[PDB]
Design a protein around this motif. Sequence first.
Motif, PDB file in Angstrom:
ATOM      1  N   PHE A   1      -3.357  11.249   0.487  1.00  0.00           N
ATOM      2  CA  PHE A   1      -3.668  11.618  -0.888  1.00  0.00           C
ATOM      3  C   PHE A   1      -3.810  13.121  -1.071  1.00  0.00           C
ATOM      4  CE2 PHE A   1      -4.554   8.154  -3.852  1.00  0.00           C
ATOM      5  CZ  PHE A   1      -4.431   7.053  -3.030  1.00  0.00           C
TER       6      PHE A   1
ATOM      7  N   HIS B   1     -11.367   3.657 -10.100  1.00  0.00           N
ATOM      8  CA  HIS B   1     -11.935   2.501  -9.417  1.00  0.00           C
ATOM      9  C   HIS B   1     -13.461   2.472  -9.539  1.00  0.00           C
ATOM     10  CE1 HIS B   1      -7.901   2.558  -7.694  1.00  0.00           C
ATOM     11  NE2 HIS B   1      -8.105   1.324  -7.276  1.00  0.00           N
TER      12      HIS B   1
ATOM     13  N   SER C   1      -1.893   1.802   0.864  1.00  0.00           N
ATOM     14  CA  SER C   1      -1.734   2.927  -0.049  1.00  0.00           C
ATOM     15  C   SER C   1      -2.580   2.692  -1.297  1.00  0.00           C
ATOM     16  CB  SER C   1      -0.264   3.116  -0.424  1.00  0.00           C
ATOM     17  OG  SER C   1       0.253   1.951  -1.041  1.00  0.00           O
ATOM     18  N   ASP C   2      -2.839   1.419  -1.583  1.00  0.00           N
ATOM     19  CA  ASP C   2      -3.765   1.024  -2.638  1.00  0.00           C
ATOM     20  C   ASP C   2      -5.191   1.075  -2.090  1.00  0.00           C
ATOM     21  OD1 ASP C   2      -5.299  -0.233  -4.620  1.00  0.00           O
ATOM     22  OD2 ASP C   2      -3.671  -1.593  -5.176  1.00  0.00           O
ATOM     23  N   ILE C   3      -6.039   1.903  -2.693  1.00  0.00           N
ATOM     24  CA  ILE C   3      -7.394   2.102  -2.183  1.00  0.00           C
ATOM     25  C   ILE C   3      -8.394   1.070  -2.707  1.00  0.00           C
ATOM     26  CG2 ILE C   3      -7.035   4.583  -1.907  1.00  0.00           C
ATOM     27  CD1 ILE C   3      -8.808   4.951  -4.447  1.00  0.00           C
TER      28      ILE C   3
HETATM   29 NA    NA Z   1      -4.667   3.666  -5.377  1.00  0.00          NA
END
Ligand code: NA
Length: 127
Positions: free
Chosen positions: A3, A15, A86-88
């Motif tokens: 990132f 988020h 890659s998705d946190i």
């Molecule tokens: Na993300």
Amino acid sequence: KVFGRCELAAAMKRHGLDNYRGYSLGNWVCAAKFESNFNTQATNRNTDGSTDYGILQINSRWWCNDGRTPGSRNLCNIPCSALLSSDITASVNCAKKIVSDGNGMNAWVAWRNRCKGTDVQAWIRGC
Ligand code: NA
């Protein structure tokens, strides 16, 4: 995925981490910096048999399952590999449980040594 600084800041904010359990956004970005260098695929083996996973280096002794940490738990109910995406989303949702289990962000060693009691706001400066 590695990132960018404000890229991660925006991702973490969306988020719902900003001020979560009292911790401003700068704290979470700072933690990510010194835990993983903003890299979701970071992994670190500890001497107790456990491993740290992901952009926030969440540990397998309590929080995720990697099938090779004797006597461990899986409180976030996820495979540790999920923390490498890659998705946190998985790392954030697990981090929220971690910080809510008392002690606050002191669970993160890197945050405790490099971020706590510093100008953490500088890590979202210019986003
Ligand atoms: Na993300």
